Amino acid sequence: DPAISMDLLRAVLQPSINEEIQTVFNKYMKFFQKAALNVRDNVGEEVDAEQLIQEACRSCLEQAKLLFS
Amino acid sequence: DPAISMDLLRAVLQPSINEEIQTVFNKYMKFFQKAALNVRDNVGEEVDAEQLIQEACRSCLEQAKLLFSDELPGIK
C-alpha cells in the first residue's frame, strides 16, 4: 500500500519536524498565553487557560493542513 | 462565548505561522518527493505522487498535535 511506505518515512522524519514546529510555536506562545489568561480573568476560575492554549495550538496545526490540499 | 477570542487570535496569527511551517517543510520535501516517485515507479501510473506527498505532510501536522496534548517524538 503506497500510503504505508510514505507513512514509514513520515514517522522517521517526525521527530525533526516536531522540533522545528515547537521552535516555531515558541515564538507565538506568549500571545496565546495572554489571550487565554484574559479569558480566565474575565470569566472565572472554571476556565482552564492551559487547555485553551493547547486547543488553539492544535487548531493552528489543523488549519495549516490547507497548505497541503 | 468569550473564549471565541482564542479563535480570532488564532486566525490573526495563522498567516505568519503558515509561512514558518512552510519553511520547515521545504527542508524535508525532497525526502517525501523521492519516496513518492519510488512508490509510483514500483506500482504504476495510477499512483498520484503529488497526492502521496500531500497526505504525508498533512499526517505530519496531525501527529505534531501531540506536542500540545496533555515521550513526544523530538530531536530535543
Author numbering:
A (entry chain B): 62 to 130
B (entry chain A): 62 to 131, 142 to 147
Study authors write:
Human DNTTIP1 (56–147) crystallized with six molecules within the asymmetric unit. The structure was solved at 2.1 Å resolution using MAD phasing with seleno-methionine substituted protein. It was immediately clear in the electron density that the protein was arranged in the asymmetric unit as three dimers. Each monomer consists of a long amino-terminal helix divided into three by two distinct kinks. Carboxy-terminal to this long helix, the peptide chain folds back on itself leading into a second, shorter helix arranged at ∼60° to the central portion of the longer helix. The dimer is arranged such that the longer helices in the two monomers lie anti-parallel to each other and form a saddle into which the two shorter carboxy-terminal helices are packed together, also in an anti-parallel orientation. This arrangement results in a large buried surface between the two monomers of 4083 Å2. Remarkably, this represents 69% of the whole surface of the monomer. The core of the interface between the monomers consists entirely of non-polar amino acid side chains. The Dali protein structure comparison server identifies no structures that are significantly similar to the DNTTIP1 dimerization domain suggesting that this is a novel fold.
Recent proteomic studies have identified a novel HDAC1/2 complex in Homo sapiens and Caenorhabditis elegans called the MiDAC complex. In this paper, we show that DNTTIP1 forms a stoichiometric complex with HDAC1 and the ELM2-SANT domain from MIDEAS. In conclusion, we have shown that DNTTIP1 is a dimeric protein required for the stable assembly of the cyclin A associated MiDAC complex. In addition to contributing to the assembly of this complex, DNTTIP1 also mediates a chromatin-binding activity that is likely to be important for substrate presentation to the active catalytic site of HDAC1.
